[PDB]
Amino acid sequence: GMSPPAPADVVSSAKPHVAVIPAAGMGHLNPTLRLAGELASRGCVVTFINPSPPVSLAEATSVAEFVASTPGVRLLDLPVQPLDPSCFPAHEDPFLRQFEAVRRSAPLLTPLLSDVSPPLAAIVCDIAICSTFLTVAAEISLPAYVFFSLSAQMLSLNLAFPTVADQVYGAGEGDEIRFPGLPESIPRSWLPPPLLDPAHLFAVHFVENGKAMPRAAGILVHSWEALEPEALAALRGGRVLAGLPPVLPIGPLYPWLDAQRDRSVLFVCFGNRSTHSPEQLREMAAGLERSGCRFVWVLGEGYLERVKERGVVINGWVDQMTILSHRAVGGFFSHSGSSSVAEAAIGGQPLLLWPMGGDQRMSALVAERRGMGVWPRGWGWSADDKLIPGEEIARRIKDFMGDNALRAVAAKMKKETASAMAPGGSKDQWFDDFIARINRV
Amino acid sequence: AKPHVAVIPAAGMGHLNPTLRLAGELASRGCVVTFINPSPPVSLAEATSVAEFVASTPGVRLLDLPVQPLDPSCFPAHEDPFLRQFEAVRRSAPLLTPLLSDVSPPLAAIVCDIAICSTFLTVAAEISLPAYVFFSLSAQMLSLNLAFPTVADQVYGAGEGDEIRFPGLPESIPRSWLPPPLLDPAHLFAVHFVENGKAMPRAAGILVHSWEALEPEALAALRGGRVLAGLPPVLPIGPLYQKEKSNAVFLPWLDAQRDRSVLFVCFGNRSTHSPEQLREMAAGLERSGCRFVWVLKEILGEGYLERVKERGVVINGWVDQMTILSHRAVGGFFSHSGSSSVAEAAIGGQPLLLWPMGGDQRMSALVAERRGMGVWPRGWGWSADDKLIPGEEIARRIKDFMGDNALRAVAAKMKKETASAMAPGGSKDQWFDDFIARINRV
């Protein structure tokens, strides 16, 4: 979906005032902080809503740095009481209960905004807590926009799932479900496992949030036309969900190597939160070593003196972006994820995908549809522990590191994404569109 | 390629002609369009207009949807035939999915006029076909229609003379200015109004006959989440007009008149003016001493025509209104203040003397008053409230109206801006590009 015509009274107006409410967890906080930055950048005054007291002090620190470093932002405190841990199953995600605590506090918010000057033009709320705030915003006639920080693909799933929910739970395992607006019929096993149990807390949040978003003034999604043209076309053209409100693509919100032939080195990082069985981690080592490609691994389990190598391994956290953009590297080996695709797209790197769980199967589809990533189907998540042997991994790496079909579209993705992040580029146009549409004369 | 789009119109010339213009505009841009025609239409005009159009326009194909008319035992309180046909084709919506099973190339979308939309949305969703509501009226009436469900109890229980705040709309609305049938919850129109106001948030999106220069604050409210929550995309698709070309001169007296000197007066198809009011209206035009073209014992009177022969022409029949409003000799439009009359005056740059008679004509008068291009004398009431205005009063208002040079200049401005919107690569082209791209499948 490309930019709607720009109507604007460029004659005279103050920049609009936007309140912003994040969901819990650094994965949700950082994109929101970037979104709020991007608004402040263009002259909007923003009021950041903090749950008080914070669940995490680090999160509140991140917030503090942001309000101190950027000028148009005020900080507002929202009292929330943590929910009772005993009524939360310990198997399910700890962050779910943190979402429910702050949802509970939405009635406290409408008095808090009454004093506020200049008047609010809108409130932006993370999908993960938005449902009860949408109702509060409606009472005070304040346009409420949902921030969906995962892919446009996940957004289409999350909106379409309630309309096909009976089909999903009636299906027999091994069945494939056709989700509206998405071309590829997909197996139910590709959905996040919790979603399959209707009683499960993730399912209950997923449907609740999927039913809440259509009530919003619109949806701001972390995607861009060059990355997800079909998903965004279907969202803006009523193919995922009838009556959907406007959907605005708001992304992207983002030594040893200098010696190697360019595009020669595979960059592999399974991430801070990766799940690999020790057998599986060891098989990765065997396969990596057997491939014969040059490689840098972010991660004993290796072997004994396994580092007698042409390759490199790194324990310490490092910016994926500097290396991904580096001439030497020609390939990105990583887990699936809305995050990993986006950086590979900015980096112009092809993607070899091993999905960990949950949404990551779905994020693999985002790469595969563009033609810039491969997920070998047997490379399942750690459920039933079907071991993937190093020989298979080595052949797959060689094959991946030779596949210039994937490498070419990734290289085009970098060019198209760079043009989107440029001044006057697609991303600016969508932020200009949003600011203009909520600005009052 | 370009998408295949199906289009469905509502009963009556006022709902058919927009849909015809919308459909022509989509074929103009290389969409192949299927015109779904509920059969049979109420009137021969509608039947003739459809046939001439599809015959005249290359991209279009005609798909007859057979609709059984409303039973006389059904809604007997309402004798209005066009209102009955709204109800009839709304009940025919389940017929449509067998009709569309054949069609190739596959349809990219369907566009349903607002009067009939609610049921056709539900059918379109079952066959997974994006459905767009065409709101052939103004953005003002769209805001009102969308917000009415949310404030209906406060409207029904409010007193006469009370003003009601509707969320998207800039100024509060007097209860007397609402369409009177709305005041009656039992009334079929009010039933349709609530069904439609509730169905439109379910559509893929809403195409509205408006443009930024005409209704900038209502289009901002609709697009900015300030009139209703969960609203789908609203795209202004106007202006839409017919007119004619390569044709003979309709009225040589009008061509012989001086620049902006003639008052063109017309009160539309459903004019509810009384015979007593018509004779007083004729006396007002005569007493004004202004040049005029008026299209509709004798209601005029004895010898009225000979007395008025140098400055007046009264015609009894159809006339192309948009052609007359774009004529260099007319300087004023004395109108029943329809939604379509106000959009046409804006295209032609004519100021409006407004006499709202019924329904949404009052809301239209506010659109024109807001832009400063029209004058609705309060006291010129609903036809249903039988207050007889004297020709001596009509003459004074006509003189003041034709003399308001400042009124004329904003009407001239509006013409200029509206012409920008029509120019290539202007606003309208971009909205239409936007829709076609929105619909188009790779």
Q: Within a 13 Å sphere around the CA of B55, how many CA atoms are in the beta-carbon half?
A: 6
Phi, psi of A105 (to 5 degrees): -85, 0
Per the CB < 8 Å rule, is A141 touching B430?
Answer: no
Give residue for tokens 């509502």.
B10
CB-based burial label for B185 (10 Å; 0-12, 13-18, 19+): middle
Per the CB < 8 Å rule, is A242 touching B202?
Answer: yes
CB-based burial label for A313 (10 Å; 0-12, 13-18, 19+): middle
d(CA B267, CA B295) in angstroms, rounded, equals 8
Please check whether residue B213 is in contact with residue B417, taking contact to mean a CB–CB distance below 8 angstroms: yes
d(CA B23, CA A310) in angstroms, rounded, equals 67
d(CA A54, CA A62) in angstroms, rounded, equals 11
d(CA B10, CA A76) in angstroms, rounded, equals 51
Q: Report CA torsion sign: B410, B414, B415, B420.
A: positive
**CA end-to-end span of chain B, whole Å?**
8
Distances (CA, A) of B115 to A93, A366, B90, B111, B341: 49, 41, 9, 12, 19
Please check whether residue B135 is in contact with residue B142, taking contact to mean a CB–CB distance below 8 angstroms: yes
Please check whether residues A139 and A242 belong to one and the same domain. yes
Q: What angle do CA A310, A313, A316 make, to 5 degrees?
A: 150
Q: Report DSSP state, residue B360.
A: T
Q: Report CA torsion sign: B170, B171, B176, B177.
A: negative
Q: Report DSSP state, residue B430.
A: H
Residues in contact with B203: Cβ distance below 8 Å, sequence separation at least 6, in sequence order: A238, A242, A243, B117, B121, B131, B132, B133, B232
How many of the other CB atoms lie within 10 Å of CB of B267?
23
Please check whether residues A379 and A434 belong to one and the same domain. no
Residue of B nearest to A247 (CA): B233
Tokens describing residue B15: 């709902």
Phi, psi of B318 (to 5 degrees): -80, 145
Distance from CA of B58 to the nearest CA of A (A): 26
Strands B234-236 and B262-266, sheet pairing: unpaired
Instruction: List gaps in chain B by the residue before each (C–N > 2.5 Å).
Output: 296
Please check whether residues B370 and B426 belong to one and the same domain. no
Per the CB < 8 Å rule, is B212 touching A245?
Answer: no
CA B338 to chain centre: 6
Stretch (H or E) spanning B278: helix B275-288
Please check whether residue A240 is in contact with residue A324, taking contact to mean a CB–CB distance below 8 angstroms: no
Tokens describing residue A184: 């590829």
Give residue for tokens 């490498």.
A407
Residues in chain B: 442
d(CA B351, CA B413) in angstroms, rounded, equals 11
Give residue for tokens 């203040």.
B337
Phi, psi of A117 (to 5 degrees): -135, 140
Nearest CB among A2, A238, A438 relative to B130 is that of A238
Per the CB < 8 Å rule, is B235 touching A4?
Answer: yes
Give residue for tokens 């406290």.
A108
Instruction: Tell me if A5 is assigned to some domain.
Output: no
- Torsion, Cα B361 B362 B366 B372, to 10 degrees, reads 70
Please check whether residues A342 and A225 belong to one and the same domain. no
Q: What angle do CA B123, B129, B135 make, to 5 degrees?
A: 75
Residues in contact with A115: Cβ distance below 8 Å, sequence separation at least 6, in sequence order: none
CB-based burial label for A2 (10 Å; 0-12, 13-18, 19+): middle
Which CATH number covers residue A332? 3.40.50.2000
Q: What angle do CA B207, A218, B426 make, to 5 degrees?
A: 40
Show which of residues 66-95 on chain A sit within 8 Å of chain B, judged by CB atoms: none
Using a CB-CB distance cutoff of 8 angstroms, which residues of chain B are in contact with residue A138? 229
Please check whether residues B137 and B196 belong to one and the same domain. yes
Phi, psi of A16 (to 5 degrees): -65, 155
Q: Which residues of A are known catalytic residues?
A: 28, 126
Please check whether residue B275 is in contact with residue B386, taking contact to mean a CB–CB distance below 8 angstroms: no
d(CA A84, CA B221) in angstroms, rounded, equals 42
A195 dihedral zone (left: phi>0; alpha: psi -120 to 50; beta): alpha
Please check whether residue B12 is in contact with residue B82, taking contact to mean a CB–CB distance below 8 angstroms: yes
Q: How many structural domains are present in chain B?
A: 2
Phi, psi of B263 (to 5 degrees): -90, 120
Please check whether residue A277 is in contact with residue A385, taking contact to mean a CB–CB distance below 8 angstroms: yes
Nearest CB among B128, B203, B430 relative to A5 is that of B430
Please check whether residues A242 and A286 belong to one and the same domain. no
Distances (CA, A) of B269 to B19, B272, B389, B402: 18, 9, 21, 25
d(CA A383, CA A401) in angstroms, rounded, equals 28
Q: In B29-161, which residue ranges form alpha helices assigned H by DSSP?
A: 44-56, 81-91, 96-101, 117-126, 139-147, 152-157
Using a CB-CB distance cutoff of 8 angstroms, which residues of chain B are in contact with residue A437? 220, 223-224
Tokens describing residue A101: 């605590």
CB-based burial label for A202 (10 Å; 0-12, 13-18, 19+): middle
Q: Which of B268, B275, B274 is nearest to B321 (CA)?
A: B268
3-state secondary structure A379-405: CCCCCCCCCCCHHHHHHHHHHHHCCHH
d(CA B131, CA B137) in angstroms, rounded, equals 18
Three-state DSSP at B28 gives helix
How many of the other CB atoms lie within 10 Å of CB of B364?
28
Tokens describing residue B193: 């109004």
Tokens describing residue B154: 């406060």
Please check whether residue B24 is in contact with residue B124, taking contact to mean a CB–CB distance below 8 angstroms: no
Three-state DSSP at B38 gives strand
d(CA A418, CA A412) in angstroms, rounded, equals 10
Residues in contact with A77: Cβ distance below 8 Å, sequence separation at least 6, in sequence order: A50, A52
Residues in contact with A100: Cβ distance below 8 Å, sequence separation at least 6, in sequence order: A83
Please check whether residue B363 is in contact with residue B144, taking contact to mean a CB–CB distance below 8 angstroms: yes
Residue of B nearest to A135 (CA): B229
Tokens describing residue A414: 């970098």
d(CA A366, CA A231) in angstroms, rounded, equals 9
Per the CB < 8 Å rule, is B203 touching A242?
Answer: yes
Q: Which of B397, B438, B135 is nearest to B285 (CA)?
A: B397
Q: Report CA torsion sign: B35, B38, B39, B45.
A: negative
Across the A/B interface, how many CB contacts are shorter than 8 Å? Answer: 91
Phi, psi of A352 (to 5 degrees): -100, 120
How many of the other CB atoms lie within 10 Å of CB of A218?
26
Per the CB < 8 Å rule, is B438 touching A9?
Answer: no
CB-based burial label for B155 (10 Å; 0-12, 13-18, 19+): middle
d(CA A234, CA A223) in angstroms, rounded, equals 13
Chain B interface includes A218 (CB < 8 A): yes
Q: Report DSSP state, residue B216.
A: H
Three-state DSSP at B378 gives coil
Distance from CA of A56 to the nearest CA of B (A): 33
Please check whether residue A410 is in contact with residue A94, taking contact to mean a CB–CB distance below 8 angstroms: no
Phi, psi of A363 (to 5 degrees): -70, -30
d(CA B317, CA A219) in angstroms, rounded, equals 52
Residue of A nearest to B436 (CA): A237
Q: Report DSSP state, residue B262.
A: E
Nearest CB among B130, B230, B232 relative to A215 is that of B230
Please check whether residues B406 and B425 belong to one and the same domain. no
Three-state DSSP at B112 gives strand
Per the CB < 8 Å rule, is A245 touching B231?
Answer: yes
Distance from CA of A241 to the nearest CA of B (A): 8
Strands B163-164 and B173-174, sheet pairing: antiparallel
Q: Which domain holds residue B395?
A: 252-418
Q: Which residues of B are known catalytic residues?
A: 15, 113
Please check whether residues B125 and B176 belong to one and the same domain. yes
d(CA A171, CA A165) in angstroms, rounded, equals 10
Show which of residues 225-254 on chain A sit within 8 Å of chain B, judged by CB atoms: 229-230, 233, 236-239, 242-246
Please check whether residues B112 and B234 belong to one and the same domain. yes
How many of the other CB atoms lie within 10 Å of CB of B152?
16
d(CA A419, CA A423) in angstroms, rounded, equals 8
Chain A interface includes B2 (CB < 8 A): no
Give residue for tokens 């950082």.
A30
Using a CB-CB distance cutoff of 8 angstroms, which residues of chain B are in contact with residue A216? 225, 229-230
Q: Which of B343, B325, B337 is nearest to B378 (CA)?
A: B337
**Long-range Cβ contacts of A234-237 (<8 Å, 24+ apart):** A234/A156, A234/A180, A234/A181, A234/A182, A235/A1, A235/A152, A235/A155, A235/A156, A235/A159, A235/A181, A236/A1, A236/B233, A236/B438, A237/A1, A237/B109, A237/B130, A237/B204, A237/B438, A237/B439
Please check whether residues A228 and A313 belong to one and the same domain. no
Amino acid (1-letter code) at residue A98: Q
Please check whether residue A295 is in contact with residue A268, taking contact to mean a CB–CB distance below 8 angstroms: yes
Three-state DSSP at B133 gives strand
d(CA B291, CA A227) in angstroms, rounded, equals 64
Chain A interface includes B167 (CB < 8 A): yes
Tokens describing residue B99: 């009709």
Helix, strand, coil share (%) of chain B residues, nearest 5:
45, 15, 40
Chain A interface includes B201 (CB < 8 A): yes
**CA end-to-end span of chain A, whole Å?**
27
Stretch (H or E) spanning B6: strand B4-8
* Mutation site, A125, A239, A434, interface B, largest B CB count within 10 A: A239
The angle that helices A152-160 and A201-212 make with each other, rounded to 10 degrees, is 90
Tokens describing residue A275: 């799940």
Please check whether residue A370 is in contact with residue A354, taking contact to mean a CB–CB distance below 8 angstroms: no
Three-state DSSP at B354 gives strand
Instruction: Tell me if A120 is assigned to some domain.
Output: yes
Distances (CA, A) of A208 to A98, A148, A202, B372: 16, 14, 10, 47
Three-state DSSP at B438 gives helix
Nearest CB among A214, A236, A243 relative to B438 is that of A236
Residues in contact with B157: Cβ distance below 8 Å, sequence separation at least 6, in sequence order: none
Tokens describing residue B70: 């409303």
β strands within B150-218, DSSP E: 163-164, 173-174, 205-208
Please check whether residue A131 is in contact with residue A206, taking contact to mean a CB–CB distance below 8 angstroms: no
Please check whether residues B78 and B168 belong to one and the same domain. yes
Please check whether residue A251 is in contact with residue A278, taking contact to mean a CB–CB distance below 8 angstroms: no
3-state secondary structure chain A: CCCCCCCCCCCCCCCCEEEEECCCCHHHHHHHHHHHHHHHHCCCEEEEEEEECCCCHHHHHHHHHHHHHCCCEEEEEEECCCCCHHHCCCCCCHHHHHHHHHHHCHHHHHHHHHCCCCCCCEEEEECCCHHHHHHHHHHCCCCEEEEECCCHHHHHHHHHHHHHHHHHHHCCCCCEECCCCCCCCEEHHHCCHHHHCCCCHHHHHHHHHHHHHHHCCEEEECCCCCCCHHHHHHHHCCCCCCCCCCEEECCCCCCCHHHCCCCCEEEEECCCCCCCCHHHHHHHHHHHHHHCCCEEEECCCCCCCCCCCCCEEECCCCCHHHHHCCCCEEEEEECCCHHHHHHHHHHCCCEEECCCCCCHHHHHHHHHHHCCEECCCCCCCCCCCCCCCHHHHHHHHHHHHCCHHHHHHHHHHHHHHHHHHCCCCHHHHHHHHHHHHHCCC
Strands A176-177 and A186-187, sheet pairing: antiparallel
Chain A interface includes B438 (CB < 8 A): yes
Three-state DSSP at B399 gives helix
Tokens describing residue B269: 């198809």
CB-based burial label for B303 (10 Å; 0-12, 13-18, 19+): exposed
Instruction: List gaps in chain A by the residue before each (C–N > 2.5 Å).
Output: 254, 299
d(CA A157, CA A210) in angstroms, rounded, equals 9
Please check whether residues A215 and A323 belong to one and the same domain. no
d(CA A264, CA A401) in angstroms, rounded, equals 8
The angle that helices A130-139 and A94-104 make with each other, rounded to 10 degrees, is 10
Strand order from edge to edge, sheet including A247-249? A73-79, A45-52, A17-21, A122-126, A144-148, A218-221, A247-249
Q: Which of B374, B330, B326 is nearest to B354 (CA)?
A: B374
